[PDB]
Design a protein around this ligand. Structure first.
Ligand code: NA
Length: 299
């Protein structure tokens, strides 16, 4: 049972290179605007303690080198919206897909098109951790790579990568520039805070396991919602709500396994471990499939 990323073609045609001074990173060219992390205007010395307003004022529209493959783009307007730069350009992107900007919630998943100096190199599926970080592969040059979901013909852009934390985990903003979590685009030590397992995702993945033939973890016991959350808090699992039970509805109906019985199987799993066995070929509980992901992949 494999992690699916969304087909990336609609985003590939939007990836551009942005160079300001000597710093260079990825941008998102939609209509006549190019979006990129504002720390493109920062030297590596600037990053220690940037005054972005002050730093942006030293910059004019011609200081910005936006290149899309070969055609260079004429910048005729620059603006700072929170932590993103918005470079107004003359040519509107002919390849602009239908798109929204969305701010997702912790636990939701999305595809990332990692790009290095403007060219896409790879695509992967990941989750917004409950502590608003993402654990991924953002190497030097991947700043400005975007996260997205695709519904039919519409690209919901939800993530732009900005920083690697000293802890090696990754942080970024929505497409309006607001960071997810308590992070700032400054090279200083920033605490991520206690991460937790996305409980509704693990339950969804267990439904995927039942759908695909793995059933050993199904138990004779059952449990109440409170008893389960009592076990959940001990193991750093996100508390399960009734909203979470509702979202798991279709999966419970497809398999004929009530949510609370599944929660009871997860309870014994948490209290006993997996005892050397695997579920869907994994020796540990996967929490980066939402119930929507499991439905989408089982449909
Ligand atoms: Na594993």
């Amino acid at each position: 049972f494999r992690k699916m990323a969304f087909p990336s073609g609609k985003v590939e045609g939007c990836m551009v290179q942005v160079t300001c001074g000597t710093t260079t990173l990825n941008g998102l060219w939609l209509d006549d605007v190019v979006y990129c992390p504002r720390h493109v205007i920062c030297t590596s010395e600037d990053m220690l303690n940037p005054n972005y307003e002050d730093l942006l004022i030293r910059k004019s529209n011609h200081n910005f080198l936006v290149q899309a493959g070969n055609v260079q783009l004429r910048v005729i307007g620059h603006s700072m919206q929170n932590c993103v730069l918005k470079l107004k350009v003359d040519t509107a992107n002919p390849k602009t897909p239908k798109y929204k900007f969305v701010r997702i919630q912790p636990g939701q998943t999305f595809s990332v098109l990692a790009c290095y100096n403007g060219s896409p190199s790879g695509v992967y599926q990941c989750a917004m951790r409950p502590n608003f970080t993402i654990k991924g592969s953002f190497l030097n040059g991947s700043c400005g790579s975007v996260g997205f979901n695709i519904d039919y013909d519409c690209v919901s852009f939800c993530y732009m990568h900005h920083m690697e934390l000293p802890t090696g985990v990754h942080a970024g903003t929505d497409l309006e520039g607001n960071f997810y979590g308590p992070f700032v685009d400054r090279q200083t030590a920033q605490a991520a805070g206690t991460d937790t397992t996305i409980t509704v995702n693990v339950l969804a993945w267990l439904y995927a396991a039942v759908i695909n033939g793995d059933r050993w973890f199904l138990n004779r016991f059952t449990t109440t919602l409170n008893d389960f959350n009592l076990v959940a808090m001990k193991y750093n699992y996100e508390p399960l709500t009734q909203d979470h039970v509702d979202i798991l509805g279709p999966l419970s109906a497809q398999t004929g396994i009530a949510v609370l019985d599944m929660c009871a199987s997860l309870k014994e799993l948490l209290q006993n471990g997996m005892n050397g066995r695997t579920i869907l070929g994994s020796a540990l509980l996967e929490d980066e499939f939402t119930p929507f992901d499991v439905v989408r992949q089982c449909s």
